[PDB]
Design a binder for these strands. Structure first.
Ligand SMILES: Nc1nc2c(ncn2[C@H]2C[C@H](O)[C@@H](COP(=O)(O)NP(=O)(O)OP(=O)(O)O)O2)c(=O)[nH]1
Ligand SMILES: [Mg+2]
Ligand SMILES: [Mg+2]
Length: 430
DNA sequence: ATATGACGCT
DNA sequence: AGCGTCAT
């Protein structure tokens, strides 16, 4: 009752760019705008693999991971942009730089946690508090929320999408209690107003559109964001959670899309997030461990406490290439040469990072995958990163992995390598 | 033949 | 330290 925490203490948003790599390419090449478009890596094998898809192209059934040749069967007029290739590998610099454009704008509004190349969490609790004082108990006009959906509304006693959106927003705003500066629903609403402003700034200053979720924690904000993509934002209130979760597959919640979510489903014999409320915290901990059990118990009630970490920069800087099928590296010369290529890209990115961000990496992690191994990494080894020198880094990387070669012959490498991955880590201020 | 980032477990 | 998980 009076002592039961409701997880309504924060206002958290998740902003995620719409078909991000596609928009980067469309901004650069106007011919690609408002068309079925995708971004692909490489070209020779089946036209290249698709990693981003415009919403026009999604309507034809084009998806991530599809070969471009196959996508063209679904969508004959599909337009394609190719990721830059440098030193024989994909070079994502253009998208990293576009990412920085967007992150720097978001950082004007609040503390952000960079969560991927195209999304950040925003802790809006403080910004909301101050905007509420500036408000002076003034009601919030629907005009301040022109792209916002209120999840779960409208309800009770129109046939077009925008009509529905407005009806729900009207019901929400009509019920809002603006006299109470501590109403979590009011706080979320003000959060949504700020996120409209943030999203307008991003679009004005970069040309890129994005979607957002506004809720009380990161998991609900992320879930909310996806509900009305593209170019819209969604408010998920604490009160919306029971109905929302009552038919929400467990795998849709962040961190439950993998083996843990599958075991929840299998062990408990349930399908939906809301069904978790029926178990005690101890029961959940008995099946999934102390940490996961506590997290699940709280999360199925809409409660989560993971903070928005003050971190706009990546923690590691890495370079990797897969060598699939018959391209697997099978000679020592092959292995040293590709380590050199990776290390040259890494050197350029590290030197740039040191100039921009006043820090230096101090450890180099070398990861490989061997043919026949379905794991991401077959083996990781580390060494000291003392110099931003590509020849030294590649030589050192070879030194720490050369043991893995089970070949009796000098020139040969076995088992053949299906991935090389260099990652610079353990940054120190510089 | 579906680049590379954060983080947990031991 | 090195491996496993989840993710975009
Ligand atoms: N090299 C590479 N890039 C990838 C991969 N997966 C995603 N990207 C790149 C490509 C993505 O454009 C970008 C952002 O990932 P999302 O936010 O999950 N998808 P998007 O923004 O495209 O569409 P929307 O959010 O509207 O659903 O990350 C991959 O597996 N490999
Ligand atoms: Mg996106
Ligand atoms: Mg994303």
């Amino acid at each position: 009752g009076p002592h039961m925490a409701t997880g309504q203490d924060r206002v958290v948003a998740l902003v995620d760019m719409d078909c991000f790599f596609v928009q980067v390419e469309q901004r650069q090449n106007p011919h690609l705008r408002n068309k079925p478009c995708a971004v692909v890596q490489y070209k020779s094998w089946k036209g290249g693999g698709i990693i981003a898809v415009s919403y026009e192209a999604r309507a034809f059934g084009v998806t991530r991971s599809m070969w471009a040749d196959d996508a063209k069967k679904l969508c004959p007029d599909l337009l394609l942009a190719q990721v830059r290739e440098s030193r024989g590998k994909a070079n994502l610099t253009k998208y990293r730089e576009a990412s920085v454009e967007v992150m720097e704008i978001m950082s004007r509004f609040a503390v952000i946690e960079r969560a991927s190349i195209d999304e950040a969490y925003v802790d809006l609790t403080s910004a909301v508090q101050e905007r509420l004082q500036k408000l002076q108990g003034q009601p919030i006009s629907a005009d301040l929320l022109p792209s916002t959906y209120i999840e779960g509304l409208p309800q009770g006693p129109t046939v077009q999408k925008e009509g529905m959106r407005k009806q729900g927003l009207f019901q929400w705003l009509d019920s809002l209690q603006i006299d109470n500066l501590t109403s979590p629903d009011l706080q979320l609403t003000v959060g949504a107003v700020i996120v409209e402003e943030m999203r307008a700034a991003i679009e004005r200053e970069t040309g890129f559109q994005c979607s957002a979720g506004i809720s009380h924690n990161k998991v609900l904000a992320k879930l909310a964001c996806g509900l009305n993509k593209p170019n819209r934002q969604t408010l998920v209130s604490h009160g919306s959670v029971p109905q929302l979760f009552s038919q929400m597959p467990i795998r849709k919640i962040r961190s439950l899309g993998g083996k843990l979510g599958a075991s929840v489903i299998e062990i408990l014999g349930i399908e939906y997030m809301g069904e978790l409320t029926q178990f005690t915290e101890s029961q959940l901990q008995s099946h999934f461990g102390e940490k996961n059990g506590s997290w699940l118990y709280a999360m199925c009630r809409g409660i989560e406490h993971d903070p928005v970490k003050p971190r706009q920069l990546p923690k590691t800087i890495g370079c990797s290439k897969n060598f699939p099928g018959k391209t697997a590296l099978a000679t020592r010369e092959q292995v040293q040469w590709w380590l050199l290529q990776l290390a040259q890209e890494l050197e350029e990115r590290l030197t740039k990072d040191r100039n921009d961000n006043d820090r230096v990496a101090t450890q180099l992690v070398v990861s490989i995958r061997v043919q026949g191994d379905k794991r991401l990494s077959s083996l990781r080894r580390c060494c000291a990163l003392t110099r931003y020198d590509a020849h030294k880094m590649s030589h050192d990387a070879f030194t720490v992995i050369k043991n893995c070669n089970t070949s009796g012959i000098q020139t040969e490498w076995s088992p053949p390598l299906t991935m090389l991955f260099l990652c610079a880590t353990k940054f120190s201020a510089s």
